[PDB]
Amino acid sequence: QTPTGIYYEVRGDTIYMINVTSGEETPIHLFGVNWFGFETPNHVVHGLWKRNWEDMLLQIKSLGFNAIRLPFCTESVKPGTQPIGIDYSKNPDLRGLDSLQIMEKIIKKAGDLGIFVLLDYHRIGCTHIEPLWYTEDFSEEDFINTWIEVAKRFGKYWNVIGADLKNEPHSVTSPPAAYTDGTGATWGMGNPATDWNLAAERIGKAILKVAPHWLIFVEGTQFTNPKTDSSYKWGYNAWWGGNLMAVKDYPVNLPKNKLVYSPHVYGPDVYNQPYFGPAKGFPDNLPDIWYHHFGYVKLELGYSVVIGEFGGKYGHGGDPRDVIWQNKLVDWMIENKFCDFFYWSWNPDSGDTGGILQDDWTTIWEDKYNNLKRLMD
Ligand SMILES: OC[C@H]1O[C@@H](O[C@H]2[C@H](O)[C@@H](O)[C@H](O)O[C@@H]2CO)[C@H](O)[C@@H](O)[C@@H]1O
Numbered sequence: 001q002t003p004t005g006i007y008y009e010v011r012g013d014t015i016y017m018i019n020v021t022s023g024e025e026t027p028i029h030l031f032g033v034n035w036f037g038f039e040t041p042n043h044v045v046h047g048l049w050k051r052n053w054e055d056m057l058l059q060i061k062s063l064g065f066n067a068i069r070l071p072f073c074t075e076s077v078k079p080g081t082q083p084i085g086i087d088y089s090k091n092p093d094l095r096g097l098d099s100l101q102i103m104e105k106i107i108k109k110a111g112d113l114g115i116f117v118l119l120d121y122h123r124i125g126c127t128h129i130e131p132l133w134y135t136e137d138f139s140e141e142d143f144i145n146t147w148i149e150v151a152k153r154f155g156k157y158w159n160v161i162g163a164d165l166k167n168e169p170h171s172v173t174s175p176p177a178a179y180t181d182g183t184g185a186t187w188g189m190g191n192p193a194t195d196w197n198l199a200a201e202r203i204g205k206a207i208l209k210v211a212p213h214w215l216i217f218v219e220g221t222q223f224t225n226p227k228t229d230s231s232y233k234w235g236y237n238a239w240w241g242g243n244l245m246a247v248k249d250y251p252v253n254l255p256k257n258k259l260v261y262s263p264h265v266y267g268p269d270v271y272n273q274p275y276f277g278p279a280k281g282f283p284d285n286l287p288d289i290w291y292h293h294f295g296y297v298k299l300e301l302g303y304s305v306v307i308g309e310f311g312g313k314y315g316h317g318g319d320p321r322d323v324i325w326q327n328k329l330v331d332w333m334i335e336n337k338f339c340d341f342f343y344w345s346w347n348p349d350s351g352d353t354g355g356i357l358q359d360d361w362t363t364i365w366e367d368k369y370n371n372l373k374r375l376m377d
Pocket residue numbers: 236237238239240241270271
């Protein structure tokens with residue numbers, strides 16, 4: 001069932017797109033990039049002070065990408081939010097539009113271009129990623145209603161593939177405090193106040209009632225439960241939204257043809273993890289780490305796994321071990337058939353990662369892009 005005539009589904013570990021009208025059904029790959037801004041105080045994808053928005057989509061497509069993960073915060077999806085930071089001289093057709101109308105116009109155009117869009121509820125406020133899907137201020141019922149409104153509206157755009165429910169569930173205290181103190185996310189504590197896995201079935205089910213044709217992307221948490229995390233030597237060093245160690249014992253209960261697990265994984269430019277020390281075997285030690293944190297969900301359990309974010313400066317003004325890190329991760333994704341992904345970040349204005357575009361928002365980093373395009377063939 002679909003409002004658009006397009007229906008998305010997971011068969012095995014592959015995402016397929018069905019066109020109910022022509023009857024066509026083919027597998028699809030997501031060669032993606034994150035274009036952020038709508039989750040920030042700008043309330044609009046960044047770079048429009050230097051570039052025309054349509055030209056940005058064209059350039060993304062010209063480099064071989066066919067998907068964009070679009071982070072947003074609650075405010076940006078409500079009528080009337082004023083965007084800041086657009087050169088109207090270069091974006092005349094954006095004059096007087098609110099942030100919601102701009103997102104609509106960008107998604108509709110990405111569709112004309114054949115670019116899939118994944119909506120990512122990145123932040124509840126517009127200043128930082130919260131550890132849970134609700135705050136002292138904003139309830140889980142509010143979070144879900146925001147999603148319901150978003151789905152009823154964007155479910156009408158054919159190229160929107162679904163929802164990444166909440167960006168980077170994580171913790172703000174240490175374990176064992178973390179698994180019960182209630183300030184952070186968990187998985188398999190059988191505690192509805194903090195179990196992201198139980199939460200995902202809830203949020204996701206609500207979205208599917210309104211957008212049955214969508215996919216539901218579920219990220220990992222940071223810590224899961226002490227049994228799971230302690231059962232592995234690097235069980236305490238997974239990235240925010242990057243711990244999927246608990247999926248084995250605590251699957252997320254959503255239909256199997258709609259669920260997509262979506263881990264995040266980063267390099268030394270983001271956090272100097274202990275396993276990045278060469279005396280610890282870096283980078284040759286990574287495959288098994290990636291395998292433990294999330295790889296096995298696809299390789300062993302057979303589920304669709306789409307890396308939601310990964311990136312780094314690739315030696316341009318950052319830690320030179322990041323070049324080796326990105327090279328190895330791409331090698332590993334290719335060998336193991338993790339063909340669907342969203343890089344972080346199309347934007348150059350990411351403090352700890354830089355992005356595909358250089359600082360002038362026009363030219364790209366060639367070496368960084370040449371490594372990544374191995375995955376685009
Ligand atoms: O995951 C993105 C995020 O991680 C932050 O590092 C956490 C980290 O992910 C966790 O795996 C590791 O043990 O340490 C840190 C400390 O908070 C890093 O601070 C971020 O800026 C990056 O946003």
